[model samples]
Target: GEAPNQALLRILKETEFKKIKVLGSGAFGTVYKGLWIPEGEKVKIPVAIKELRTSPKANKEILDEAYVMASVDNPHVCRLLGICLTSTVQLITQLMPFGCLLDYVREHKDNIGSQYLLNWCVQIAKGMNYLEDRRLVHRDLAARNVLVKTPQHVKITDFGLAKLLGAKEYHAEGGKVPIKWMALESILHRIYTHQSDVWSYGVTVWELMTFGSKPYDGIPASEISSILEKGERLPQPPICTIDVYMIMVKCWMIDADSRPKFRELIIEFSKMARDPQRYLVIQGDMHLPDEEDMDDVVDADEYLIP
Candidate 1:
């Protein structure tokens, strides 16, 4: 196990919290929205605290997440405020006012312009690019895993699924997997690397295009093999430009080595942002109809997966 990190913050006083309310819960823990106001002080800060569901197996996960967060210092990656380790173990992080990228895109798609959406692509790509440069793989890259600080900016998070790479690849580590976002190689052989993460990034880009629709609605997760063998893939997101669709297709190339690095996508995404002609709509609006109108819209609730 790695030694205790002095670089990461450590908040030992539980009494410093004036308020803590449950925000979300899953296998990770009960995340809380907390107001931290030291005793007899008016100044306060809003923070997100994860009260880890400690069990026989959770300590390592807690430590691992802390270690990874402490090590990652990129602006696009969320900052690890500290760990509350006195009465209980909990991770404290900065609060994102806009919530996860999934929710932001869902609510703001109609209002946010295409250029800003493309900018979010570069923001996230830069973060992933930083992760890769440090020999780290964000195994669970998704819109949900990205936290939005504002409409235009995002920070990658949820390091519980991150793996430190000594080489280019690593074998899958857990029973649970986001099958819908899995690359062909990840699903077929369980090999994971930045390439697999790139595949997930492409799916996330599709989410951006579709305002967070369920991916691969027509295909079953169980039937990915047949489709991959036949060179089939997720249908182009209706509002996505032909170029965006083509770039995403590059990420899904069956051969892991063939997938573009996050740095390459950084260059390419910047180009798309700089040139409107590279995307679908320059100044004009995307013609995607409302959910009620399904004449051109793909199935909203079709699930071929079991």
Candidate 2:
């Protein structure tokens, strides 16, 4: 005899969920924004429910992600609300009211000045530091994975690609993983450690400075990999202030051992956040060039050394 439909419905009803709205989609499954009503509350609270597709590998991936998230209990990291592992698989997590960092950057491109960028960088560093302390590496630490709860408070999410350094060997997706916003060592070897994550953090800083410009936008993925393997980097704009540029470069250092630890990154970003005036002197002072001033703008070659 098949399981009764009411059995599944009963589990859903116990949660007191009012609605389920699609939040995002990925290869493994679709995420939904679920509204739940507490026992005595007339109000609905938001939760993110990740529903896994019915595939052996996908199910394993979801289980691993849920286990990892539940084990972590840091404020800078996303909170796991609940989990349901029955006929269908689901993992519920806290919903960030402000949405993912990617959407936020796109919506407020012009308004996100240097000061905001510095603050965001600091928050990311703190979150990464938290993960580092636990011996976990956020293999995918991009703007898309970092989410905001409030303007100043951000939490790192999307741990599907996360890895524990000493746990097991990690295979790349199809032996050709996306190299965007990654350090050269991680891109080349497919080995992720805390230091490699810091390299990705540097790319995150570059994304913030450029208002979430696509990493390696104009370049092809093949070219990006080749150049990165040679220890080359993306050109910096004049708008990329000196201090920010220095930090970005440090993050991309070729030797993973030489990369600054998240602890150091946190301290550095904290100083910039505390005294924005000192680090972000040109926070919102950008001046678009007039037709005549266009000639005065230095050539892009000046920013890159051959």
Candidate 3:
């Protein structure tokens, strides 16, 4: 209804970006590590370029994506620097040096401590809290959607499934949702709310605790609905302490309204972060049997064991 390209001023010439390499790919399309050279400047900023698949008719939606990202300004949220609208649509943002969190954690699990893992949980909650305050739901909240800036810091990225809620709930018209990370109501009803995001947040925490283990490992997508409907849930990760696991359980409540809000998650995680005694295990505790048992099982059968 408005001017076709009102956001055109934010677009830079495609020539400015020097693609260094491919970073990752998914809902927002393929991401590449690139350098953005400003006009008439000697400075070159390292940025992550998200190449969105688009057509002439999809231009308006691309512009909307830019505006949605531009409106977001938070430490936990990735910053949108600019956009490119040639034959393809691309968005430029700060390059996360450590790349996607799932890969980073999997590659560095031996060096990561429990406290560090919980801190990431707290930070993700803080990020989700910011999104909730703005009435935005990150429909696809998971480890892969989070980006690592450093060993100690992470920022939520990939707003491909994000939507600004005009009401309390949104009814999605189609499928293609992240069913494994979805809440019960989201799976059964195709309705997404802030609470659904909390459910996904819990799954993200499990992924972090397990060093990027897949949620509901070995479970088929076709059968997840009935499984969730029966109140079954993902098991506690070998590394997750009971206290932290309890928070994840609260987020996965069958009644969406009963789930803890992101603010509450931040409070619970922050307290555990500040006082490690309640959740962290001492070197000799040996209380977590899952850790000991998992060592004997082959990687392929790790999740299959009861």
Candidate 4:
């Protein structure tokens, strides 16, 4: 039986749903945008269904995932509309029209204003803080996992997406896990915690400011470890303020525990939100050396993967 709070839980008969259409697919499974017809004036509702695979083999596991989704109800989170426990398990969530945050930045970063991006940072922090309260760690906390309806309003999606999708190796030629955004602990030990997520959030913030520039674009993976060891973090983007850049620096501290918790981030981000105008100006730093130091570098992407 589904938990008491899981009001959305129900037996989804095959015929009840009409116009089943897949919107897209990810490493976990396919996402379908479909119409749901119910018994009463249930008026058909447009829904997005995510079918998870490669993890959670049994009913207990599926139900648990559903329960967790049902338990959490926040505007900053993608709502878990319901679930179907039949042979072909299905997870129903809301439709985020703007799509993944990463794609949004890549496609419309220039058109949108900066204050909205800052507000999104606050929203993301709020969502992460909610999950932190439940002791849930987001192993893959990159911009791609976040979804949006508008640039000003966003939600964190893919609660358990990483556990089922990752290649199970920290060092790899790359399948899903973007090693560049991982915290030092995760890169060094393959261990992830809520704090490691904070590190990734900083990268997300950087991504927004840089309009989706690849982090460590030319640096080799092996050199990344050495560079991080040498305390060379990502150089500040032209659009960032010292204050905003400092928050990123704080998030990237070598000691994961030293990083600000999501709640703390929310507090600081609130200030940015209040004066979103400050974030709009994308200017360059007058003082800094030529960023690349290849004397101690190589074709490090390959070196990084191993």
lDDT of 4 by residue, 18-69 (tens): 6778788876467887755554434455567777643446444556666666
Q: TM-score: which is higher, 3 or 4?
A: 3
Off by over 4 Å in 3: 1-9, 24-28, 53-61, 282-306
- Per-residue error at 232 for model 2, in Å? 1.6
Distance from true location, Cα of 276 in model 1, Å: 3.9
Per-candidate TM equals: 0.84, 0.80, 0.84, 0.77
Write down the TM-score for model 1: 0.84
TM-score of 3: 0.84
Candidate 4 regions exceeding 4 Å error are: 1-10, 52-67, 161-176, 218-223, 282-306
lDDT of 3 by residue, 172-264 (tens): 888488889998888878889889999999999989877889887787898999988788988987656788888889989988898998999
Q: Which residue pairs show backbone clashes in model 4?
A: 220-300, 221-300, 221-304, 239-282
Give the count of colliding residue pairs in each prediction.
Answer: 0, 0, 0, 4
lDDT of 2 by residue, 190-279 (tens): 777788888889888777777777888877787777878777876674457678688888888888888888889888878877766666
Which parts of model 1 have CA positions greater than 4 angstroms off? 1-9, 26-28, 37-43, 282-306
Cα lDDT computed for each candidate against the true fold: 0.77, 0.70, 0.77, 0.71
Worst 10 residues of 2 by lDDT: 297-306
Model 4's TM-score against the true structure: 0.77
TM-score of 2: 0.80
- Ranked candidates, highest lDDT first: 3, 1, 4, 2
lDDT (10s digit) by residue, model 1, range 1-306: 444435644564787774677778975578888665545644455678886776566656787888788777787998676677755578877777678888888876776567777888899999999999878888899899999876766899999878887736679755888888888878778888888999999988888878888787767778876777799877787667888999899988888888888999999889988974458453454432112323432211121111
